[PDB]
Design a protein that fits this description.
Subcellular location (chains A, B): Nucleus; Chromosome, Telomere
Strand content of chain A: under 5%
Number of helices of chain A: 8
Subunit structure (chains A, B): Interacts with nbs1. This interaction is required for phosphorylation of histone H2A.
Organism (chains A, B): Schizosaccharomyces pombe (strain 972 / ATCC 24843)
Helix content of chain A: 55-70%
Largest sheet of chain A: none
Protein name (chains A, B): Serine/threonine-protein kinase tel1
Order of helices and strands of chain A: HHHHHHHH
Family (chains A, B): Belongs to the PI3/PI4-kinase family. ATM subfamily.
Largest interface: A-B, 5 and 5 residues
Structural class of chain A: mainly alpha
Radius of gyration of chain A: 20 Å
Oligomer: part of a larger assembly
Distance between the termini of chain A: 48 Å
């Protein structure tokens, strides 16, 4: 369904003034299509559908955008949106970056001592660091 | 016996050219006295005997000096004598500082799997680092 929607989108709709109007020349909602795409694991399509909706109505879902940026295979992703800067957010940022200064080992040690998939993150950081 | 030795060394020697040779009025080898003092747990006294012996014979026991400086209460000890660096001198020097740069945690982690005392040094390094 996403493929046929995109395929109709590329073709020039009849008596359509705007190419984006040709995208909506079939009346569809881009948020639900983008959610289905991200559930279909083809993330570039989900990003395209988000861009369609934002260019139309500016209705980007922050949760969906953050999740897409996370799971997206591109290297410089997951930094597209800036989450509320808490300890957990910088813990995730460190475990994704895998940095030695202010290493995620310190953050996960704080989590374990304070009893706050953190275990998987700690083990991954330990194995990827070298210890 | 060490108390008598020191008491006699302190006294003014009649027709004695040097206070140095006055410290050697009773013929003895100060190196064995210093080793006994180190075994007597009076490390400052052991260093005094070691330096008087080195003033006489210039024949200090390097291993004995390292053993003395390992337990000396002064914080800026352990660096008087340099041990030619190997993968055991780096670890032992980093244990004392308990520092995160040039991580003693890293060297301990490497040695715990390369199999190159440690069962307490590692735990104390981890505790001192704060993890």
């Amino acid at each position: 369904c996403m493929n046929i929607l995109l395929y109709l989108r590329r073709q020039l709709g009849h008596h359509a003034l705007n190419p984006f109007e040709a995208n909506y020349w079939v009346p569809i909602n881009y948020s639900v299509a983008a959610s289905t795409a991200y559930d279909c694991h083809l993330y570039e399509q989900s990003l395209l559908f988000l861009t369609i909706h934002n260019t139309k109505t500016d209705e980007l879902d922050i949760t969906l955008l953050s999740d897409i940026l996370s799971q997206l295979p591109c290297p410089d992703a997951y930094y597209g949106i800036k989450r509320e800067t808490s300890f957990k957010n910088i813990l995730l940022k460190a475990v994704h970056e895998k940095r030695s200064p202010l290493a995620i080992s310190y953050l996960d040690a704080a989590n374990m001592y304070r009893s706050n998939g953190t275990k998987m993150m700690f083990s991954n950081t330990l194995n990827n660091a070298g210890f």
